[PDB]
C-alpha cells in the first residue's frame, strides 16, 4: 500500500496517520486499550522502547491533554531521558490543544464547553512550580514561530476531501487564537504580527515550515490543504503591510 | 539548499568578518543588502568559530586515493575533497569554516570554494609541509 501511494518506506506512511491512530486508540478508554498495548509491530519498531523513542513527540501531547502525567513520567524514566526536556520539546503540540478553545465563544453549548473546561484545568495545572510554570512564559516567548506553525497546520475549512489529523479548527478560530495570544502578552498588543516582527527572522522560519511539509508529501489533497494554510498566512502577512515586517518585507 | 544557505548566511553575518564586510558594503546600493536585513542581528559578543588542533593535520589530505579515486563519480569526489580540507585544522579564515553545510549539499559550491581553501591553507603554511604535500 505504501509503495503504491508513493512513500519510500512504510514508516513514513504509517507515521503520516500516527496522531489519528494514537487518539483513536486512547478514545476507547478501556483497561486493555493502553499506549503500551498499541501495536507498534505495525511500525517497523521491534520493541516498545524504540517506538517511544521514535514517536514521543506525538504520544506525549495526547497524554498531557488527557492528564496522564504519570504515564508520560513512566515513558520518561523507561526511555532514559530528561523528563523536563521531553515535556519541553512537545510544548507547541500541547499548546495547540489547550489554547484554541479559550478564544472561541466559551460556554456556547454543552458540547464544546467541556473542551474549554479541561483545557483551562490542564493549563492552570502546568502553571505549578513542579511543572514548567516557572518558565512557561519564557518558553512561550522563546520559540513563537513553532506555536504559529502548529496552530496554522490545524486549519480545516468545511469540499469532499479527507480531513487532516484529529486536531483541526476553522480559520476564524485560528485568527481568534492569534488575537488571544497577542492579548495575553505582557505589553498587550492588538496584533500577533507585532511581536512576530520583533524578530524578523521568524517570518523566514514560518514560511519555511509551511514549505517543508509541502515538499515532503506527494498527496494532492494534503498539498492543497498546505497551500490553503500558506494562503491564509500570506494574506495575514499582507494585512500588516502598513508598518513593514520589521525590515524583512523585501 | 535554502535552509543550508540561510544557516550559512546567519553564521557568516554573525562573525567579526561579516560585520566588517557590512561596514564597508552598506554604502553601496544593492538588493542583496535588503534581502539580508532580517538574518543580521546586533549582539554584544561576536560569534566565535572553534579551533581544533589536530594531532596530525596532514593525515586527512595525505591520501593518494582521496585525490584520485576517479570512479566516474565527480560529485562525491569533490565533496569528499572539500570536506577533507574543511575538517583539517589548517584553515585559518573563520568564514571558510562555516561553509561546510552548504558544501555538503551543492557540488558547484565545493568547486567554487576549493581554490579558496587551498589558498588559505598555503597562506598560513609554515616550513613548507603543506606546500610539499
Curated annotation (Swiss-Prot), chain A:
Compartment list:
Nucleus; Cytoplasmic vesicle; Cytoplasm, Cytoskeleton, Microtubule organizing center, Centrosome; Peroxisome matrix
Q: What tissue expression does the UniProt record report for this protein?
A: Found in pancreas, kidney, skeletal muscle, liver, lung, placenta, brain, heart, spleen, thymus, testis, ovary, small intestine, colon and leukocytes.
- Give the domain of life: Eukaryota
Annotated spans, Interaction with ABL1: 161-170
The record gives the effect of mutating residue 195 to T as: In T-prolymphocytic leukemia
Cite the post-translational modification comment.
Answer: Phosphorylated by NUAK1/ARK5. During the late stages of DNA damage response, dephosphorylated following deacetylation by SIRT7, leading to ATM deactivation.
The record's induction entry says:
By ionizing radiation.
Give the family, as the similarity comment puts it.
Belongs to the PI3/PI4-kinase family. ATM subfamily.
Q: How does it assemble?
A: Homodimer. Dimers or tetramers in inactive state. On DNA damage, autophosphorylation dissociates ATM into monomers rendering them catalytically active. Binds p53/TP53, ABL1, BRCA1 and TERF1. Interacts with NBN (via FxF/Y motif). Part of the BRCA1-associated genome surveillance complex (BASC), which contains BRCA1, MSH2, MSH6, MLH1, ATM, BLM, PMS2 and the RAD50-MRE11-NBN protein complex. This association could be a dynamic process changing throughout the cell cycle and within subnuclear domains. Interacts with RAD17; DNA damage promotes the association.
* Disease named in the record: Ataxia telangiectasia: A rare recessive disorder characterized by progressive cerebellar ataxia, dilation of the blood vessels in the conjunctiva and eyeballs, immunodeficiency, growth retardation and sexual immaturity. Patients have a strong predisposition to cancer; about 30% of patients develop tumors, particularly lymphomas and leukemias. Cells from affected individuals are highly sensitive to damage by ionizing radiation and resistant to inhibition of DNA synthesis following irradiation. Defects in ATM may contribute to T-cell acute lymphoblastic leukemia (TALL) and T-prolymphocytic leukemia (TPLL). TPLL is characterized by a high white blood cell count, with a predominance of prolymphocytes, marked splenomegaly, lymphadenopathy, skin lesions and serous effusion. The clinical course is highly aggressive, with poor response to chemotherapy and short survival time. TPLL occurs both in adults as a sporadic disease and in younger AT patients.
- Domain comment quoted from the record: The FATC domain is required for interaction with KAT5.
Function recorded in the entry: Serine/threonine protein kinase which activates checkpoint signaling upon double strand breaks (DSBs), apoptosis and genotoxic stresses such as ionizing ultraviolet A light (UVA), thereby acting as a DNA damage sensor. Recognizes the substrate consensus sequence [ST]-Q. Phosphorylates 'Ser-139' of histone variant H2AX at double strand breaks (DSBs), thereby regulating DNA damage response mechanism.
Name of the protein described by the UniProt record: Serine-protein kinase ATM
* Source organism (scientific name): Homo sapiens (Human)
Q: What is the lineage of its organism?
A: Eukaryota, Metazoa, Chordata, Craniata, Vertebrata
Source gene? Answer: ATM
